[PDB]
Nucleic acid binder design. Structure first.
Ligand SMILES: [Mg+2]
Ligand SMILES: [Mg+2]
Ligand SMILES: [Mg+2]
Ligand SMILES: [Mg+2]
Ligand SMILES: [Mg+2]
Ligand SMILES: [Mg+2]
Ligand SMILES: [Mg+2]
Ligand SMILES: [Mg+2]
Ligand SMILES: [Mg+2]
Ligand SMILES: [Mg+2]
Ligand SMILES: [Mg+2]
Ligand SMILES: [Mg+2]
Ligand SMILES: [Mg+2]
Ligand SMILES: [Mg+2]
Ligand SMILES: [Mg+2]
Ligand SMILES: [Mg+2]
Ligand SMILES: [Mg+2]
Ligand SMILES: [Mg+2]
Ligand SMILES: [Mg+2]
Ligand SMILES: [Mg+2]
Ligand SMILES: [Mg+2]
Ligand SMILES: [Mg+2]
Ligand SMILES: [Mg+2]
Ligand SMILES: [Zn+2]
Lengths: 173, 225, 60
RNA sequence: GGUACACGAAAAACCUUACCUAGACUUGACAUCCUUGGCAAAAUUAUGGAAACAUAAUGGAGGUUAACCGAGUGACAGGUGGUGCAUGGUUGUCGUCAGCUCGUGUCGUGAGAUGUUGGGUUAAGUCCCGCAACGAGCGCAACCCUUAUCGUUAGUUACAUUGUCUAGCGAGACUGCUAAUGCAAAUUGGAGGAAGGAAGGGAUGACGUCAAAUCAUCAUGCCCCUUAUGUCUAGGGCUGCAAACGUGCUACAAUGGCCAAUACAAACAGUCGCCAGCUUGUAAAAGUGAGCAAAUCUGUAAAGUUGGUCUCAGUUCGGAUUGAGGGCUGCAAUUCGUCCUCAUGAAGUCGGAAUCACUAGUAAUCGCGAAUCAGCUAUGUCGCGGUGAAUACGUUCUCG
RNA sequence: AAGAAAACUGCCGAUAAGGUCUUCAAAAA
């Protein structure tokens, strides 16, 4: 045997264990009403991103946090969109619209950092982007902010594809 | 609503009695009945680190026989058979010196699928401040991997020291409780916490026993592979 | 005041009619089964655990 | 409130008892841990005592201290003391109603929806179809017990008018066959059958609601008391009484009252018990005394049948209340046991507004047995058998 | 053969105050 073991107590609290890269962005507490009582279920809004150009979001509901957590985990794993970065930032200024939520994204010089806050900051970090100017011009619901932010980033046009189509020279004037 | 005790509902049909004796008179029917409760309670409360799953008592006009199944009999046995003699003296004092005691510590097979040590292990985790969700989930997963049917654990009480009492259940599989032919083992334990008392209830399903006999054969006692 | 009543019941009285029967596990005085020396609510735990030989549920 | 009110309590004279008045006690009537010995506690006889308790006695089983008997000793023991709105455990209720959810998937920005809703069939979310749903779990059903017919084993303590009866195993009923119509589940009819379409009854009661009930079964967090909210004993109290309600018993009567004879049960229980027979007694009962540790002995069956009488009345109805004399249990029957005998003979002659239970061996009714128990106006509770009905057209109204 | 078939009405008012209950996913040899 001689499993050694001296000093310390038990299993303390080590943990690590992760991949790709994520972070909880909201944990709401939804409930329905039945014939006596209230069925209460936790809802989580997880943002999954590899910090290199792959990012997805997943919202899930379950009777307990661990369950709903891993549900949203797999959920984002499934719906992952592809993101392209230019010098670490966003290429052109864009306004993302989703319902009554409008998110303004603006290119930033290398150094300013992520000037975002809330759902947008999580998305920008999880996407890979560094320097980014943002302002939330609408509502403060995390799900709609994520919807608006992703819509703005997915409608982005590459400096290459435009001229290709446009029959111009790569990026040349 | 209220449910009939699962062990008590299956007595006389598929499960035998833990104590099998016939007394002389209604005065000796009470002494021989209280004494065994003391003996069984003694075994279970103290000498607990052994995982004693069930102790049966067998008495005749004057001869008392004890059959004790445990998962770790080293603590009963002690250092070169010490604690065993010690425990023997307790039992003799309880029943009386005029009789003959015949302890028969038997090692147990398939320790997992016994509702006593599982409930005891669940109860032990709660006194050690272990988080309830983690403790319950870890015990169930080892139990499910051990190769049995569904297990239902109900842990009602002032959960996590709360001031409002709750109750958490966790079913995992087909546990037909209304069925008599099933081999369902039931046990109950009192986790004594600094904030009060916790009631843990464990229902375990160990297959289907079409046998019309009452035990008459080791149940989880059997040692399979 | 239960244990003292239990102890006094165990002790013999000075008159025969002074002797009553209490439950032997707990100390309940009323609803005691002389057939078993066990009160009605201790009989459930013993009957539901198999400690009492032959005590099975009844169907009629 | 339903889901409290013949409930906890399956037995309040003492005891129980948790209450009051008093007389007494303080690591205590009970327990462990520790320094330390065991060369006792009992019980009983004395005196003082309402009894607790004291002073004196036989000084006590045993086993050398095992258990206990102690000393010393402080941590403490103790609480039916509070909080069931801190709880565990157990239970009522919707309700044995047919529901309550989960996994994966899909839709929706979202709470969420889907499955679980449609059409048929059931007691049933029971099943079959349809179906962005596919499956699963708990519940439902069956497996369990018992009753209804038979086969087999056994024949005493049953039977012995010879195959009852008792208890082990098994067979039997499976919409199994047929007719009708439905895709299919399935519905109805018929056949045979002891039993036909959950053959009757019981155990079995999902997630949950009501912060439903219990700290007074027990256990327990916390708070409170610690020469007193703890302990022992005697007496009282839980049994009151201008009143109101609930649940039952007895009646107001000739479908009956009284007297005599007399036939037919099942189940259960019994050695401080069941008590046969005999003797005494107007009777409750006493004495003698077998038999039975029990299919052996004991625990009277009554309604029912026949005969006599009463002749519609406050009575030969109805038994209350009151007085006296007895019997039993128990130290002890006044507060406050019941039984018998004699004496008396309230109300009541079918009960207002409004309400309860019940669908066959059921309601109604007649006895018998058991539990707790020394004894007990238990007319209560849990059981067993005898006799044994009426009605259901229908869901318009009523409750859920 | 083209039928239908028909509502019907009485009355029916109120319910003291403030109040729990979601602890948490960090995730687990
Ligand atoms: Mg409702
Ligand atoms: Mg007590
Ligand atoms: Mg008594
Ligand atoms: Mg109630
Ligand atoms: Mg008293
Ligand atoms: Mg001596
Ligand atoms: Mg000595
Ligand atoms: Mg409550
Ligand atoms: Mg439904
Ligand atoms: Mg649909
Ligand atoms: Mg369907
Ligand atoms: Mg059933
Ligand atoms: Mg309450
Ligand atoms: Mg208390
Ligand atoms: Mg007294
Ligand atoms: Mg009373
Ligand atoms: Mg004879
Ligand atoms: Mg006679
Ligand atoms: Mg009369
Ligand atoms: Mg009197
Ligand atoms: Mg009916
Ligand atoms: Mg009018
Ligand atoms: Mg007003
Ligand atoms: Zn008891």
């Amino acid at each position: 045997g001689h499993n050694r073991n001296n000093q310390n107590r038990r299993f303390q609290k080590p943990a690590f264990k992760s991949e790709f890269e994520e972070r909880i962005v909201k944990l709401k507490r939804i409930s329905k009403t039945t014939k006596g009582g209230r069925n209460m279920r936790f809802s989580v809004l997880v943002v999954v991103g590899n910090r290199k150009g792959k990012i997805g979001y997943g919202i899930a509901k379950a009777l307990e946090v661990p369950n709903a957590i891993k549900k949203a985990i797999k959920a984002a794993h499934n719906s992952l969109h592809t993101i392209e970065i230019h010098k670490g930032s966003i290429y052109h200024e864009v306004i993302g619209r989703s319902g009554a939520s409008r998110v303004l994204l603006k290119p930033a010089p290398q150094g300013t950092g992520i000037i975002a806050g809330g759902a947008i900051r999580a998305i920008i970090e999880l996407a890979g982007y560094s320097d980014i100017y943002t302002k939330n011009l609408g509502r403060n619901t995390p799900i709609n902010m994520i919807h608006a932010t992703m819509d703005g980033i997915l409608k982005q046009l590459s400096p290459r594809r435009v001229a290709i189509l446009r029959n111009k020279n790569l990026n040349e004037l | 609503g209220q449910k009939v005790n699962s062990n008590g509902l299956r007595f006389g049909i598929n499960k035998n009695w833990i104590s099998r004796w016939t007394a002389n008179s209604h005065a000796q029917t009470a002494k021989w009945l209280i004494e065994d409760e003391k003996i069984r309670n003694l075994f279970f409360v103290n000498y607990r680190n052994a995982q004693v799953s069930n102790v049966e008592i067998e008495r005749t006009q004057a001869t008392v026989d004890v059959f004790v199944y445990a998962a770790q009999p080293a603590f009963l046995i002690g250092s070169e058979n010490k604690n065993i003699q010690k425990i023997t003296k307790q039992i003799k004092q309880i029943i009386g010196r005029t009789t003959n005691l015949d302890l028969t510590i038997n090692e147990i097979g398939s320790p997992m699928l016994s509702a006593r040590i599982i409930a005891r292990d669940l109860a032990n985790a709660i006194e050690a401040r272990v988080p309830l969700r983690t403790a319950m989930r870890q015990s169930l997963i080892k139990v499910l991997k051990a190769g049995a049917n569904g297990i239902k654990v109900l842990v009602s009480g002032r959960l996590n020291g709360a001031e409002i009492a709750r109750d958490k259940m966790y079913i995992e599989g087909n546990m037909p409780l209304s069925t008599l032919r099933a081999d369902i083992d039931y046990a109950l334990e009192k986790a004594q916490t600094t904030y009060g008392v916790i009631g843990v209830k464990v229902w375990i399903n160990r297959g289907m026993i079409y046998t019309k006999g009452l035990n008459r054969t080791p149940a989880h006692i059997l040692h399979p592979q | 005041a239960k244990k003292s009543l239990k102890v006094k019941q165990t002790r013999i009285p000075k008159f025969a009619v002074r002797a009553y029967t209490r439950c032997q596990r707990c100390g309940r005085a009323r609803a005691v089964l002389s057939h078993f020396g066990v009160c009605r609510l201790c009989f459930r735990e013993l009957a539901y655990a198999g400690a009492i030989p032959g005590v099975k549920k009844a169907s009629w």
